[PDB]
Subunit: 116 residues, 4 copies
């Protein structure tokens, strides 16, 4: 699994479940092309977005749909989404975990990058 997304809820102290995630990759014309999408499981994890073959070098954007998540809990949050933009695989294949910790008016994101 070359790209995994994990989302946690800082209000409830739990995984953030059923969070929609859309991944985009910058094309040669500088536009953001849809790359993969999914939603977090009961563990707050999203697996299976892509494959080693498909996940080539590029600039990727991981958009985490935080607003939809919060509204369903009765909270009117600040942000539209959390966006995470990074260059991937420019020194060869790596495995990326993109993690996000969510609050209604704040979020934090970190990456764990490992070499297979």
């Amino acid at each position: 699994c070359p790209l995994m997304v994990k989302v946690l809820d800082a209000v409830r102290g739990s995984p953030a479940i059923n969070v929609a995630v859309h991944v985009f990759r910058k094309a040669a014309d500088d536009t953001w092309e849809p790359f993969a999408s999914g939603k977090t499981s009961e563990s707050g994890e999203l697996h299976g977005l892509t494959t080693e073959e498909e996940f080539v070098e590029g600039i990727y954007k991981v958009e985490i749909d935080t607003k939809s998540y919060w509204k369903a809990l009765g909270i009117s949050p600040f942000h539209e989404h959390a966006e995470v933009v990074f260059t991937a695989n420019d020194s060869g294949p790596r495995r990326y975990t993109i993690a996000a910790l969510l609050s209604p008016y704040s979020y934090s994101t970190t990456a764990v990058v490992t070499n297979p």
Copy 2:
């Protein structure tokens, strides 16, 4: 000052100085139109981006050029930039501070919205 941006450095324990910041407003066709920009000061702050008259309700994006900041310090970073996307809403408090705390492989952002 309806919109202020503040940036801090979690590696050095300091304001993040001379960081480029660009603000965009979402247009009717869903594209991002340049709205305001500047560089953070010695206190890590960027004031004077807009005025009450110009800062109407709508969706805004604040892009913070974190990659260039880390590169200038000789530190290899993860993100191309930090992006903060939010709706300005007239019912809520009037002044928005978008703050960001930067590390090479992580960032955190919060909004302080007050009267």
Copy 3:
């Protein structure tokens, strides 16, 4: 103002107002001796804790009473309090700001140390 404490609320997007803060200094027998305390202001800030003369090198602990803050808002929190423990060092920059961003099950803290 060699030591300032600033507290923000990640749920409401606001300063954390009227939060009790206690500062302790580590004594020679390893016990924590009360040093200074106060409540955060309407801007989430606590100034005037100590003076240059009194704030000598040593290990300090800042305890932020987060549990009472959340309980007053009707929100069930995880932590008893947030604790920030650090060494004051004379070589470094002179003014210390200990900042904390609070959520019910999480908190983040940073130091901004400047001249």
Copy 4:
């Protein structure tokens, strides 16, 4: 596993490996009694600190030795340690993950609490 500690490094984008962790429990006389200790593995996780039987109701302090961690990387950090203090098991047994994300002058901690 009723209590697990996970530590990540925000400078390197990796697990924080070999981080010492000491857990204390408040005694009846209000002193902090040593409860369990260990260090994080290659995954940044510390398992096996305690058992369901031993981990009774109480106020617990998880002290993560961040200063020692950073000095070994050549960084003179701000904090002595990160302390995480919480009441546990007061509504019956729960499973607790205490996570911490470390930078030289900052750290963030969150808890994931689940009901077995």
